[PDB]
Write a protein that binds this DNA or RNA. Structure first.
Lengths: 120, 81, 96, 50, 126
RNA sequence: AACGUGUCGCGAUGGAUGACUUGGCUUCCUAUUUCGUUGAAGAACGCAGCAAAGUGCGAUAAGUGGUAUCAAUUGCAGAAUCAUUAAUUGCCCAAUCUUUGAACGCAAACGGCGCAUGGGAGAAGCUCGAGCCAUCCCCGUGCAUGCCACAUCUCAGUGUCG
RNA sequence: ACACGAGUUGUUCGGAAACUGAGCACAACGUUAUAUCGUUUUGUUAGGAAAGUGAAGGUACUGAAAAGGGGCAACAGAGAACCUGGGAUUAUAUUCCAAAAAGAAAUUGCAUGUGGG
RNA sequence: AGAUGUGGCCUGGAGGUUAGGACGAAGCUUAUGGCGUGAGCCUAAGAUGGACCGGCCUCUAGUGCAGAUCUUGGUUGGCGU
RNA sequence: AGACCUGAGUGUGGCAGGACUACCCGCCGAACUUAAGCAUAUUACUCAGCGGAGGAAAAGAAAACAACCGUGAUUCUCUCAGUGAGCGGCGAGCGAAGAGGGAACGAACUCGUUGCCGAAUCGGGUCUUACAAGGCCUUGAGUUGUGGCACAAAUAUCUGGUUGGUGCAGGAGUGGCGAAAUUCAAGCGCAAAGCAAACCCGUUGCUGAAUACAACCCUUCAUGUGAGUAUUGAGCCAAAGAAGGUGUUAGCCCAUUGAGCCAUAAACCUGAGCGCCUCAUGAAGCGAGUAGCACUGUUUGGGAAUG
């Protein structure tokens, strides 16, 4: 979905981007305390990551990220919620670039990424 | 009465479906596809209607055996070692 | 032979006889006329339906009446012999 | 009429299946356009000549 | 139910795949009956794993049978009687084209005179 | 008076303008870039837990296999449970690939009918329920025509000879 | 209308397997710059070697006899072995009914058994 | 009829330059006035709008509508006939 | 009897058949139009029809130009030249060639013939890791001639190669995968705004006309401003300022942006990459229903005739 000059090919390759590209494209920055440790600027968000919203109207909420909805270009958190008309709660989705990764889940291919990103 | 009246004298069908062209253009009394020329080996295409030729082009179908070979040719006929 | 591939030889029954019908008049053919109803491979003979009913359900079919629905699917009314109970083999599958 | 080839019978068999309305849930797909089926049909108008 | 992991199938003998193939289908064709009278959705959504498993068992039987015949035809005496389906398919033109050997056939003269006067690297620089 | 006219405030009918753009047109470049009897292009039917169209796919049918990727897909239900041997998505080497079409066993508004050849099923009959299995049914392969080579084959001529 | 379920059952009914007709045009041959042209039933293709069948005989050889290739064209012509009864239906029936088939028949293929040759 | 002139008005864009805009851009509406002989410009108000955009020099063109039995979409009197 | 020649049947191995058709190559081939009418002419050796192929096709290796101090396959561009050429009811109109500046270019070769040889040839089996450019065999094809040697770039015939076949090796380009920098601080209708008039002063001083606005007027309660990609201030990255994403206008929120990293069927490219077995190797003639010629028709600038 690389930025081109042409903006017609850029927006096209961006919104027709398949799932895996949509995993990279929607990636949050991770907190300084996790930049110190892993020496990495930002990571793509996984399901269980615990994450803080910096961007808006929920600014300052903290939650566990139920699931990453890649079709709507959105993340679903815990404790980021709204009640419908009828009184049930529905998870309000937030875009990752507006959010901050405080605590990220670790699995063996997700570590092979952090070794592979290292700036040092 | 070349009419509404004689318009109800029309009975039967002069054209039925065809096997290759799949249209209603197959002539019955004698036997031809008015569109696909069936049963001639060679199809029916004329340069006086180009709008017509481009409904018969290689592209308009599923291209099933194009999709495969174009992928082999592009990949130079790879095999396992 | 240029076909190669594989022929199973035990599956030729499962392709012929597909799911049975629960419709109101298929259930009446069970209690009264001792028959089942199956959507069958639209390509099937009556002799095959007689054979693949001997394979799958191990019951002899004295009479078969094929039909082809307006939908393209080929129904069959299989009359299984009076030594056999079609209400027995039905509950061996479904039904209600 | 009663007569028909079987090849012709199936073409009307397919066209009878295609007349069903658009499922209710398929409206709810995210980013959905289709509302009502635009290819539906009635024998009284636009007659298949198969 | 569930599925048969593909590493397990490549290990088993042919008769053990045929033996297992059918009894997946019998559990499929017993699920077709459950699509008619419906209960258990939990039971009903199990039809994919059984279809693809049967797709997976046949995948092995076919690559094995396709493998064994390609070995079955090796000796050149036994070549050229090999089925059309086993022979390697190339575009119609490439398969009829002159092979890199037959286009390079050179007359006995052309070889003498391309030995007597080979092309030669040089530099005119200084 | 009533109708009708006129101005303003709001309101309807109607869908213009602007802002927006995964489209179009045209120009340019790269290359181990050119289909088909090993059944193509086009045609028909089908396939999804739910599926009309569209896309994908072919009885292994919304996909199998292999590598790379690294936790989804998502309208709903369903589902091994995170170290990859079962997420997904891209890519491709191994597969499958119905009915047809140059269509080619013969036909055709017929899911029709063959001749060889192997194979399956067979509640009659025979055999001691197993084994065989007539007629019927079923499945795979071969079989258009012309041409080229060939076999060290079988033949034709008041053609030329012995 | 619309929506949601269901409904079309055959040894004998109609077609096809298997007739020929006005006719059609595959092969063959000939034309044409080019077949996408013509001939192709007056008994019948083709300058034209298109029979794959086998009488009698000898034990799967020997060769009498048969001239004129393949196919399509009729749901009103030719051809065709089944009839009524019903409580068998929401909707099909000379199609369904099961031991007292409500029952009665017709006909094709093969096969054993008894009777004869 | 015709010829030409304008430091002459407008429009979509490109090279420059100078500015504006969520404290509200283009668009739109108005017994909103002001300026110019005029094409037009500009301000005011919107109980309009929701994100773009003006001036000036130069370049550029698919650049200015009332009429073609003009094209397309809509509406309308005739008519509750 | 058998052979040869001519011609059939069958088996075995294969191929032609349709699609695409922008460009290309053969044939066929018009009229509208222009001439102020119209018939030759023009439109045009174009549209339509038929046949065929490629990744280009066609052409091409002098029976060529020129008349010179001479050039040297073919194609293509500029120019020759809309021509003091030429064709034309000499009207409308039509219309090239050689030379020159250039693109390209390792660009050349083999048959027939003649002379010397005379089956050394080809196919099929089999064997050598092999359908070997190999050995053996083979009335199978072939003497009604396959093949070898030399003809002007010539002027005697008896170390080299990865383009002969076999099996192993490496680096490389090409494909695919992954791989940077730096941000806070002020909270709300109103200063999350200004002014100090080139630059400096300014790393400083000063401050608020919004006591809001909300519809006949006045008054009294009520209610109302989404998200900071803006503003102000402070700071930082730049071999990265790239232009896409995000709730407003983003170098620093994200993706990119770049030296490089791993993976790799064969081909491809490199002391024709590098080793190994076998295998090779430094007198006479020169194209016949052809060239011409006549008639006819056609086409061309080609005229007593270009094809």
């Amino acid at each position: 979905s690389i930025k081109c000059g042409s903006r017609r090919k850029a927006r096209r390759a961006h919104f027709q981007a398949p799932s895996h590209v949509r995993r990279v494209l929607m990636s949050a920055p991770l907190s300084k305390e996790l930049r110190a440790k892993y020496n990495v600027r930002a990571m793509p968000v996984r399901k269980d990551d615990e994450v803080i919203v910096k961007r808006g109207a929920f600014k300052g909420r903290e939650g566990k990220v139920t699931a990453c909805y890649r079709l709507k270009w959105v993340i679903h958190i815990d404790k980021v919620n709204r009640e419908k008309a009828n009184g049930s709660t529905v998870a309000v989705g937030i875009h990752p670039s507006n959010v901050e990764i405080t605590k990220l889940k670790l699995t063996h291919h997700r570590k092979a990424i952090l070794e592979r990103k290292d700036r040092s | 009465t070349k009419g509404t009246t004689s318009m109800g004298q029309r009975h039967g069908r002069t054209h039925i479906l065809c096997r290759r062209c799949g249209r209603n253009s197959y002539h019955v009394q004698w036997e031809r596809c008015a569109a696909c020329a069936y049963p001639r080996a060679s199809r029916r295409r004329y340069n006086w209607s180009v709008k017509a030729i481009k409904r018969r082009r290689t592209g308009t179908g599923r291209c099933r055996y194009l999709k495969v070979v174009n992928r082999r040719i592009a990949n130079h006929f790879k095999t396992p070692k | 032979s240029n076909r190669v591939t594989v022929e199973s030889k035990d599956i030729a029954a499962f392709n012929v006889i597909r799911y049975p019908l629960t419709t109101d008049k298929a259930m009446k053919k069970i209690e009264e006329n001792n028959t089942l109803t199956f959507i069958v491979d639209a390509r099937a003979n009556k002799t095959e339906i007689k054979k693949a009913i001997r394979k799958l359900y191990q019951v002899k079919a004295v009479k078969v009446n094929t039909l082809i629905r307006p939908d393209g699917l080929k129904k069959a009314y299989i009359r299984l012999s009076a030594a056999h109970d079609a209400l027995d083999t039905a509950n061996k599958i479904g039904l209600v | 009429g009663r007569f028909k080839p079987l090849a012709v019978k199936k073409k009307y068999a397919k066209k009878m299946n295609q007349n069903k309305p658009v499922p209710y849930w398929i409206r709810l797909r995210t980013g959905n356009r289709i509302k009502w089926n635009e290819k539906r049909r009635h024998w009284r108008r636009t007659k298949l000549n198969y | 139910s569930h599925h048969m992991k593909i590493k397990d199938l490549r290990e088993k003998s042919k008769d053990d795949l045929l033996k297992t193939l059918t009894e997946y289908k019998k559990e499929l064709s017993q699920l077709r009956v459950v699509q008619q009278t419906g209960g258990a959705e939990t039971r009903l959504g199990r039809i994919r794993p059984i279809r693809k498993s049967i797709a997976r068992i046949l995948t092995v039987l076919n690559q094995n049978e396709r493998s064994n015949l390609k070995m079955f035809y090796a000796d050149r005496k036994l070549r050229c009687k090999t089925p059309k389906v086993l022979r390697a398919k190339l575009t119609h033109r490439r398969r009829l084209a002159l092979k890199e050997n037959e286009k390079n056939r050179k007359t006995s003269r052309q070889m003498r005179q391309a030995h007597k006067f080979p092309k030669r690297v040089y530099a005119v620089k200084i």
